[PDB]
Design a protein around this ligand. Structure first.
Ligand SMILES: COc1cccc(-c2cc(-n3cc(CNCC4CCCCC4)c4ccc(F)cc43)ccn2)c1
Ligand SMILES: Nc1ncnc2c1ncn2[C@@H]1O[C@H](COP(=O)(O)OP(=O)(O)NP(=O)(O)O)[C@@H](O)[C@H]1O
Ligand SMILES: [Mn+2]
Ligand SMILES: [Mn+2]
Length: 260
């Protein structure tokens, strides 16, 4: 009933005073939608002080996000202003994939093949949009376990961007022109800690040490613990330094491992 401590404009989403997860800018409460009767994540972020143009473009982006609809992607219902910004998405109650790994050291090859395949289908869906969507912050903490089946969904598109369709560019500007292969690189690291149950580059203290190891062709210490050679080769092709030498999602789905 209307225990709601927060308000919906049309009267569709009620905010309860039950904090389900606490973060940097994201304070997510437990909500409820009275139309599809689904429990809903009521998320509210710090007030964005944006101009009369960027307050505009957030609106058109929110209705883009409503067009997305994939079984491997957490659904985006609506968003609105209120006093800050409050986002409203499907509620995940089985936790994230990383916490699912924080309790066991070996994942069955069946579950790893199945869940990784569903992640690729999610990434592919985002990349086949017009304009294509690049997640840019893919990790096991942004992948959620859902349902009785135990399927996986990719959420938290906060650091995502649209695929952007000079002469003496500096080296860092050649790196600024990246693309969807940043999600493939992130997929390789996800599949790595799903088969090792160990955070990649845990032996490193900061990103500086991590960057110096990748460009020098030094993989995480945990990479030499992958028991399955076929899995080890897939991760290899995803975390290569040159983006042009990384696997494509189509080839990964057409890999013998994921067609098995
Ligand atoms: C299914 O989608 C989900 C699911 C779960 C969480 C989120 C989410 C989105 C945001 N979020 C971030 C932006 C910034 N612009 C980048 C944006 C531009 C359009 C294409 C996607 C990226 C933004 C703009 C409008 C908006 F309604 C929400 C927005 C912040 C935090 N969680 C989205
Ligand atoms: N759709 C959702 N349903 C239920 N819980 C969620 C949902 N999205 C996020 N959460 C939880 O809310 C909390 C916020 O975490 P997160 O989304 O990582 O933002 P953050 O903590 O600021 N960034 P990070 O540095 O990546 O942890 C986490 O505990 C999530 O597990
Ligand atoms: Mn997150
Ligand atoms: Mn290749």
């Amino acid at each position: 009933e209307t225990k709601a401590v927060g308000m919906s404009n049309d009267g569709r989403f009620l905010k309860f005073d039950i904090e389900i997860g606490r973060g940097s800018f994201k304070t997510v409460y437990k909500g409820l939608d009275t139309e599809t009767t689904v429990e809903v994540a009521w998320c509210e972020l710090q007030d964005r002080k944006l101009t009369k143009s960027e307050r505009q473009r957030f609106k058109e982006e929110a209705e883009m996000l409503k067009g997305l609809q994939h079984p491997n992607i957490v659904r985006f219902y609506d968003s609105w202003e209120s006093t800050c910004i409050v986002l409203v998405t499907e509620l995940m109650t089985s936790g994230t994939l990383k916490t699912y790994l924080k309790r066991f050291k070996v994942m069955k090859i069946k579950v790893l093949r199945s869940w990784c395949r569903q992640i690729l289908k999610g990434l592919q869906f985002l990349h086949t949009r017009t304009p294509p969507i690049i997640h840019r912050d893919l990790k096991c903490d942004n992948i959620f376990i859902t349902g009785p089946t135990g399927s996986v969904k990719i959420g938290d598109l906060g650091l995502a961007t649209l695929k952007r369709a000079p002469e003496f560019m500096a080296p860092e500007m050649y790196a600024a022109a990246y693309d969807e292969s940043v999600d493939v690189y992130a997929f390789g690291m996800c599949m790595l800690e799903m088969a090792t149950s160990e955070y990649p580059y845990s032996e490193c203290q900061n990103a500086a040490q991590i960057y110096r190891r990748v460009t020098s062709g030094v993989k995480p210490a945990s990479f030499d613990k992958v028991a399955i050679p076929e899995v080890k080769e897939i991760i290899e092709g995803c975390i290569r330094q040159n983006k042009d030498e990384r696997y494509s999602i189509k080839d990964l789905l057409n890999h013998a491992f994921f067609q098995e």
